[PDB]
Structure 1
Amino acid sequence: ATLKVIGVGGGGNNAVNRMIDHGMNNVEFIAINTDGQALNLSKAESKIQIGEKLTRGLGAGANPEIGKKAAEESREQIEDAIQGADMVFVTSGMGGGTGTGAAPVVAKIAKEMGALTVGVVTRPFSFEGRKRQTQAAAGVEAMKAAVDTLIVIPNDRLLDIVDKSTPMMEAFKEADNVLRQGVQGISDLIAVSGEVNLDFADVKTIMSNQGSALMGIGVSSGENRAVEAAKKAISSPLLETSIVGAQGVLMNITGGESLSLFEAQEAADIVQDAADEDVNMIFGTVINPELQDEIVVTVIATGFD
């Protein structure tokens, strides 16, 4: 399964650059923007400049109608860069001109191309004002109509996890975790054949045409490791959609040879209970004898809609 991450606009491109800097095994990156100068500085292997005639290589100037029209006019170039992808993650900040209008077009194209299409977008800081928030809200809704599943990160949530001195770029890389570990988690499922196996068909079942989603990874060791890791997988402060109300869950537990059936059940009960719903669970287990006391809980939750 070929997995592609697409950054759309300023924020999405920066996301792509940070994930490449961090290091991502087995993923193709595509940078899409109206802003030529920013695209030139992208570390992405594939780069698409949209709306050249519209913007003369500049950004969209906070007009999302320009972002949309730019994307529509580069439809073929977008289709070519996508083609062959089984799963596409479209990442973008909502509120500007490019991301807000272009992202939902790129997602729609991706789904049309047959890819399972996941959106990971931000909402602007409240300090950015009501217009930008309202513009972003319209983008989020268009994005929701366009993707199989949508993860939304309010930038205001970043203020909940910094101290007064945390560098902004540091905050930004934390928001990146959501996407990064979701991709790496899915990538790892697909790659390894587990003792109780989950594959891309199961990802497709859990995420297809679903609306809101949560994706998390939790890692822990020691006495209550299974429970701690399950808790961490479902507990992000950055998320608009929490685990509450989930009806479908894909949960994988990775551990060493010491992984007990009892603790697998504990982990699952943490998830089931936090959803506060009868969850349709698709359960997986991987024994990695490279690991020792570490266990890894991977969660993809949907069915909120």
Structure 2
Amino acid sequence: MAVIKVIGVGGGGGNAVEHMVRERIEGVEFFAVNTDAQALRKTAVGQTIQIGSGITKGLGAGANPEVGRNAADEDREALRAALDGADMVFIAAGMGGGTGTGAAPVVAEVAKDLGILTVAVVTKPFNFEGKKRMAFAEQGITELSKHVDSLITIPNDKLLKVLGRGISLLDAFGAANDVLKGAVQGIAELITRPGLMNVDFADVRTVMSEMGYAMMGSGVASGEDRAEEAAEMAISSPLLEDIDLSGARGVLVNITAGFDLRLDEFETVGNTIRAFASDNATVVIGTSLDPDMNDELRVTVVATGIG
């Protein structure tokens, strides 16, 4: 009965959501939001929303965060009616662009005023993307912060540590689809595919509402040490590198396994987490169930209220 919506804001936001739509996230609703009307039909999302029938002529706000923000501020009604009835919204945007940097904080402000739990998941641009683009994405993230419960930042420069040599631009870019997707799929699935130690929506609102800056990390592992090792990969993740795990106001943990999860594996994940987090922090550890999983484990960690 919970309603989860994911909003791909911008050109690269709609890229990631198109990939979440193709790869399927279970029990959520996907929307695509952009100024570029051309690429807003050349996507099989199913819910298309162009911001600015007028303020833009169906063209694209190229590297344009000024009228990208204005383009959004011109149909704050088109946004509101697609939002209505949501318990939770995911705003997935490529930061440092034009249309995505200005609309995402507007999109987030509407959902916040409708009382929707607003999580923004956004990507800091690369190196080869340059310094005008990256400093763009700082002004978006600080404008986004003033209108979200939780803001997960993933800096794309972290991906070049796991991206091999000779990978193309397209490679470096579907890779950033996946970190956005994982950040949405590892949160939503506590709600949509809950396991036998469940995290309901209220537990989620608590770790994540009015909390601000957030960061996340994931691990997989199989065999006899899958729990110790997946946890170590998640606490050690580079996407989480910049953060004193101990300094977050909250930690949300999602153990994704499939039935054969041992009582003392849950032990292991829990105590590892409890050691690297503050004894006062809102610590929420539960599982999601994937029956198609056997002898392998996945752990997802999101550290909230890091700011």
Deviation readout 1:162-188 (Å, 9 max, x if unpaired)? 222223323222222333223323333
Rounded Cα–Cα distance in structure 2 between residues aligned with 1:126 and 1:106:
27
Assess if the C-alpha contact under 8 Å between 2:193 and 2:289 holds in 1. Answer: no
Assess if the C-alpha contact under 8 Å between 1:250 and 1:282 holds in 2. Answer: yes
Assess if the C-alpha contact under 8 Å between 2:108 and 2:144 holds in 1. Answer: yes
Rounded Cα–Cα distance in structure 2 between residues aligned with 1:35 and 1:240:
35
Report deviation, 1:272.
2.9
Most deviating of 274-283 and 169-178: 274-283
AA in 1 matched with 2:269: A
Q: Does 1:210 align with 2:211?
A: yes
Q: Residue 302 of structure 1 corresponds to which residue in structure 2?
A: 304
AA in 2 matched with 1:55: T
Q: Residue 229 of structure 2 corresponds to which residue in structure 1?
A: 228
Rounded Cα–Cα distance in structure 1 between residues aligned with 2:182 and 2:281:
23
Report deviation, 1:257.
5.5
Aligned to 2:167, the other structure's residue is in SS state coil
Change (3 A) 1:128 1:175: closer
Change (3 A) 1:96 1:291: closer
Report deviation, 1:193.
5.2
Q: Does 1:106 align with 2:127?
A: no
Change (3 A) 1:239 1:176: farther
Assess if the C-alpha contact under 8 Å between 2:150 and 2:305 holds in 1. Answer: no
Q: Residue 255 of structure 2 corresponds to which residue in structure 1?
A: 253
Assess if the C-alpha contact under 8 Å between 2:16 and 2:181 holds in 1. Answer: no
Change (3 A) 1:254 1:8: closer
Match for residue 268 of structure 1 among 259, 270, 287: 270
Rounded Cα–Cα distance in structure 2 between residues aligned with 1:175 and 1:23:
17
The within-5 A match list for 1:119-268 is 119-192=120-193, 194-239=195-240, 242=243, 244=245, 245-255=247-257, 259-268=261-270
Aligned to 1:151, the other structure's residue is in SS state strand
Report deviation, 1:108.
0.8
Report deviation, 1:87.
0.8
Assess if the C-alpha contact under 8 Å between 1:212 and 1:241 holds in 2. Answer: no
Report deviation, 1:276.
6.6
Rounded Cα–Cα distance in structure 2 between residues aligned with 1:232 and 1:286:
18
**Identical aligned pairs, as a percentage?**
53
Rounded Cα–Cα distance in structure 2 between residues aligned with 1:134 and 1:288:
40
Which runs of no fewer than 5 residues in structure 1 stay unpaired?
none
Assess if the C-alpha contact under 8 Å between 1:253 and 1:297 holds in 2. Answer: yes
AA in 2 matched with 1:91: A
Q: Residue 295 of structure 2 corresponds to which residue in structure 1?
A: 293
Rounded Cα–Cα distance in structure 2 between residues aligned with 1:287 and 1:123:
31
Report deviation, 1:302.
1.4
Most deviating of 256-265 and 201-210: 256-265
Give the number of the structure whose residues are more often helix, by fraction.
1
Q: Residue 10 of structure 1 corresponds to which residue in structure 2?
A: 11
Most deviating of 177-186 and 4-13: 177-186
Q: Residue 65 of structure 1 corresponds to which residue in structure 2?
A: 66
What value does the CA root-mean-square deviation take over the aligned residues?
Answer: 2.5
Report deviation, 1:147.
1.0
Rounded Cα–Cα distance in structure 2 between residues aligned with 1:98 and 1:246:
31
Rounded Cα–Cα distance in structure 2 between residues aligned with 1:21 and 1:257:
26
Deviation readout 1:255-279 (Å, 9 max, x if unpaired)? 4665444332221232233447754
Assess if the C-alpha contact under 8 Å between 1:247 and 1:277 holds in 2. Answer: no
Change (3 A) 1:195 1:66: same
The within-5 A match list for 1:8-87 is 8-87=9-88
Rounded Cα–Cα distance in structure 2 between residues aligned with 1:286 and 1:93:
28
AA in 1 matched with 2:271: D
Assess if the C-alpha contact under 8 Å between 1:227 and 1:267 holds in 2. Answer: yes
Change (3 A) 1:144 1:9: same
Assess if the C-alpha contact under 8 Å between 1:230 and 1:268 holds in 2. Answer: no
Change (3 A) 1:75 1:257: closer
Aligned to 2:284, the other structure's residue is in SS state strand
Report deviation, 1:212.
1.6
Rounded Cα–Cα distance in structure 1 between residues aligned with 2:136 and 2:84:
30
TM-score normalized with structure 2 length:
0.89
TM-score normalized with structure 1 length:
0.89
Report deviation, 1:41.
0.8
